[PDB]
Unconditional design. Structure first.
Length: 574
C-alpha cells in the first residue's frame, strides 16, 4: 500500500506539471489579451485541468492517509484528495468557471466616464486622481464613479459565486469556502491569533488615525471632518483607503525638513518599468539569492500594453510549473509606490525559483502570508532614506519621524483594512451575511476597524466590495494581514543576522549574505512542513508576533502620543 502511494505521487507530479503548464499558458494569454477567443480557450482549459484533478483526486481519496507511513507522501496525498472546484458536477463547474471569468473581465475593463466622453480606467487614471487631487468633489467623483461602474456591475454575479464556491468547499469536506481558505494555514487557533495581533496594533493605528484626521480637518475644513468621528473614505490618497502614503504632503510631521520628489527624481533620470525590476533583481542577488532567468525579461508584461489590447492590470507573479518559465504581469507606473510593488512581485518569483524542485503539490509558501512577505521584506530596506539616496532618488530625529510617518501611512494604515476584507467574506461564506446585507455589513466593518465612513450614503444596488480587485477575482486576503505582521519579524531577524545595531528602522540588509541564507533555507521548504518551522528558521522562534512591527515604529508611536495629546485628540470614533 505504501508502494502504490509513492508511485501515485510520482505519477501525479509528472502529469500535473504538464497539465498545469498548459493551463498557465491559456490563463496568461487571457490575462494579457482579454478577448472572446482567449476567454473561450481559457474556459476549455479549465475543463481539462479539472478532468485531471478529478482523476487523480478520486484515486487519492481511495488511500487511507491514516495508514500511510511516509509523512511527505502522507501530506501530498491528503492535499490531492481536495479537488477544489473540480469536485463540482460538470454543469455547476462550467457555470462557476464562467462566473469567475465574467467577474474578472468586468472588473478589469470597467471605466468611469465624464459627460463629454473622457472615460478613465482604474490604472493609471483613477488611481492618479485619488493620489494627487486635493479637491473634495473631484475625489468624490472618482471614488463614487468607480464603485458605480465596477462595484454595482459585480453584484449580479456574487450571490451565485458564493453558492458555487461554498458547494465546492462542502464537496471537499469543509463547512464553507471560508473554512476551506482558512485551512491553508493549518492553524486551528488562526482566528484568535489574528484577532490578538490586530488588537496589539490598535494603539498605534488609532493614534495615526487621529493625527491624520486632524490634518484633513486642517485642509478640507471643519464642516467636512468630525474630529471625534470616522474619516471620509475618499480622502486618503488611495481608492480603497488601504494605504495612505499619497497624502504624506498633508500630514508631514516636520515640513521644515523637505523630502525629494522621489517620483520626479525617478522620471527625471529616466527610470523605466524594466529598470525598476532590474533594481529589484539586483537586491535579491546581492543577498546571494537567485536572479530571474533571461526568459523572464522576454516573456513578462512589465508595462500596460499600448497594443490597443485589453488586459488585467493588477500586479501578479506567475509560476508556469516547469521550473524554468516565471513571469510578472503588471501595468507598472514609474514612482516609488510601484517600485515597492515590483519588489513584492519579484519576491513571489524568488519563492517560485527556490522551491521549483519540490513535488508540485508542495510548491507553495509555508503559508500564504510567507509568499506575500518576501518581496516586502527587501522593499523595507529599499525604502530607507539612505538606500533611496544611493539610487540617487533622495538627497536626524526630524528626518526619522518624517520617514517613520511615510512608512506608517502604508504599513500601519493597511493593518485594519487587510484584517477587514476576509472578516467580511468569512461571514458571507458561512451565511451570516446575505446578499440583502452585503454592503451594509461591509461598511459596518469599514467603520469598526478602519474608522472610515462613505462620503456618499450607499443605496440599494451598491456593492462596494466588488470594487476591490480581490473580491471579484476570488483571491483570499488574510494573507496580506499576516504578511504585514511577519515581514517586520523577518526584517528584525535578518537585520540582527546582518549585524545591524541601533534603531530597527535604520536597517538596510542590502548585500547581506547571512540574511539571504535564512530566507533561502526557509523558502526551499515550500509547503513541505508546518509553517512554524519556516518561521523558526528565519526568526529563531515559531510564532507570529506584532513585537517587531511595534519595535520598528516605537519612535513614531511616542511622537504621535505626544502630538495627539497636546492637541487634545479623542482617539477612536464614539
Ligand atoms: C489578442 O488575442 C487575439 C485572439 O483573440 C489574437 O489574434 C491577437 O493577435 C492577440 N494580440 C496580441 C497583441 O497578441
Ligand atoms: C475528461 O474530460 C474529457 C473532455 O474534456 C473527456 O474526453 C475524457 O474522457 C474525460 N476523462 C479522462 C480520463 O480524460
Ligand atoms: C518519503 O517519500 C518521498 C517521495 O518518494 C521521498 O523523497 C522521501 O525521502 C521519503 N522519506 C523517507 C523518510 O523515507
Ligand atoms: C472632458 O472632461 C475631462 C475631465 O476629466 C477634461 O479633462 C476634458 O478636457 C473634457 N473634454 C473636453 C473636450 O473638453
Ligand atoms: C508561541 O505561540 C504559542 C502558540 O503556538 C503560544 O501559546 C506561546 O505563548 C507563544 N510564546 C511566546 C513566547 O510568544
Ligand atoms: C526576449 O529575448 C528574445 C531572444 O530569445 C528576443 O528576440 C526578444 O526580442 C526579447 N524581447 C524583449 C521584449 O526584450
Ligand atoms: C496589497 C495587495 N497587493 C497585491 O494584490 O499585489 C492589494 O493590492 O490590495
Ligand atoms: Cl469601499
Ligand atoms: Cl490566505
Ligand atoms: Zn503578492
Amino acid at each position: 500500500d505504501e508502494a502504490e502511494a509513492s508511485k501515485f505521487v510520482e505519477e501525479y507530479d509528472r502529469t500535473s506539471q504538464v497539465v498545469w503548464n498548459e493551463y498557465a499558458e491559456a490563463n496568461w494569454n487571457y490575462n494579457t489579451n482579454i478577448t472572446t477567443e482567449t476567454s473561450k480557450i481559457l474556459l476549455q482549459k479549465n475543463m481539462q485541468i479539472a478532468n485531471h484533478t478529478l482523476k487523480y483526486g478520486t484515486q487519492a481519496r481511495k488511500f487511507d492517509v491514516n495508514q500511510l507511513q511516509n509523512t511527505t507522501i502522507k501530506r501530498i496525498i491528503k492535499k490531492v484528495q481536495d479537488l477544489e472546484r473540480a469536485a463540482l458536477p460538470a454543469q455547476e463547474l462550467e457555470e462557476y468557471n464562467k462566473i469567475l471569468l465574467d467577474m474578472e473581465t468586468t472588473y478589469s475593463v470597467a471605466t468611469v466616464c465624464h459627460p463629454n466622453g473622457s472615460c478613465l480606467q482604474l490604472e493609471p487614471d483613477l488611481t492618479n486622481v485619488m493620489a494627487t487631487s486635493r479637491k473634495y468633489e473631484d475625489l468624490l467623483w472618482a471614488w463614487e464613479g468607480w464603485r458605480d461602474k465596477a462595484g454595482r456591475a459585480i453584484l449580479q454575479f456574487y450571490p451565485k459565486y458564493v453558492e458555487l464556491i461554498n458547494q465546492a468547499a462542502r464537496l471537499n469536506g469543509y463547512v464553507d469556502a471560508g473554512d476551506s481558505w482558512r485551512s491553508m494555514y493549518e492553524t486551528p487557533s488562526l482566528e484568535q491569533d489574528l484577532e490578538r495581533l490586530f488588537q496589539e496594533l490598535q494603539p498605534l493605528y488609532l493614534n495615526l488615525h487621529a493625527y491624520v484626521r486632524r490634518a484633513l480637518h486642517r485642509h478640507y475644513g471643519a464642516q467636512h471632518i468630525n474630529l471625534e468621528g470616522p474619516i471620509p473614505a475618499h480622502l486618503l490618497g488611495n481608492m480603497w483607503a488601504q494605504t495612505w502614503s499619497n497624502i504624506y504632503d498633508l500630514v508631514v510631521p516636520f515640513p521644515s525638513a523637505p523630502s525629494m520628489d522621489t517620483t520626479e527624481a525617478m522620471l527625471k533620470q529616466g527610470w523605466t518599468p524594466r529598470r525598476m525590476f532590474k533594481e529589484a533583481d539586483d537586491f535579491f542577488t546581492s543577498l546571494g539569492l537567485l536572479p530571474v532567468p533571461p526568459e523572464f525579461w522576454n516573456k513578462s508584461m512589465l508595462e500596460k500594453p499600448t497594443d490597443g489590447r485589453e488586459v488585467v492590470c493588477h500586479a501578479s507573479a506567475w509560476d508556469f510549473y516547469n521550473g524554468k518559465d516565471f513571469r510578472i504581469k503588471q501595468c507598472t507606473t514609474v514612482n516609488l509606490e510601484d517600485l515597492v510593488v515590483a519588489h513584492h512581485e519579484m519576491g513571489h518569483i524568488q519563492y517560485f525559483m527556490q522551491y521549483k524542485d519540490l513535488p508540485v503539490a508542495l510548491r507553495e509558501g509555508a503559508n500564504p502570508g510567507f509568499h506575500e512577505a518576501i518581496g516586502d521584506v527587501l522593499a523595507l530596506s529599499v525604502s530607507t532614506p539612505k538606500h533611496l539616496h544611493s539610487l540617487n532618488l533622495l538627497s536626524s530625529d526630524e528626518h526619522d519621524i518624517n520617514f517613520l510617518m511615510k512608512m506608517a501611512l502604508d504599513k500601519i494604515a493597511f493593518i485594519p483594512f487587510s484584517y477587514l476584507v476576509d472578516q467580511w467574506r468569512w461571514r458571507v461564506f458561512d451565511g451570516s451575511i446575505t446578499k440583502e446585507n452585503y454592503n451594509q455589513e461591509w461598511w459596518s466593518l469599514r467603520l469598526k476597524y478602519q474608522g472610515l465612513c462613505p462620503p456618499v450614503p450607499r443605496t440599494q444596488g451598491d456593492f462596494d466590495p466588488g470594487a476591490k480587485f480581490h473580491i471579484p477575482s476570488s483571491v483570499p486576503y488574510i494573507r496580506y494581514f499576516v504578511s504585514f505582521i511577519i515581514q517586520f519579524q523577518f526584517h528584525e531577524a535578518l537585520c540582527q543576522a546582518a549585524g545591524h545595531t541601533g534603531p530597527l528602522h535604520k536597517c538596510d540588509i542590502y548585500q547581506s549574505k547571512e540574511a539571504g541564507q535564512r530566507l533561502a533555507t526557509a523558502m526551499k521548504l515550500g509547503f513541505s512542513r508546518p509553517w512554524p518551522e519556516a518561521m523558526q528558521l528565519i526568526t529563531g522562534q515559531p510564532n507570529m508576533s506584532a513585537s517587531a512591527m511595534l519595535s520598528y515604529f516605537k519612535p513614531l508611536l511616542d511622537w504621535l502620543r505626544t502630538e495627539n495629546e497636546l492637541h487634545g485628540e479623542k482617539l477612536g470614533w464614539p
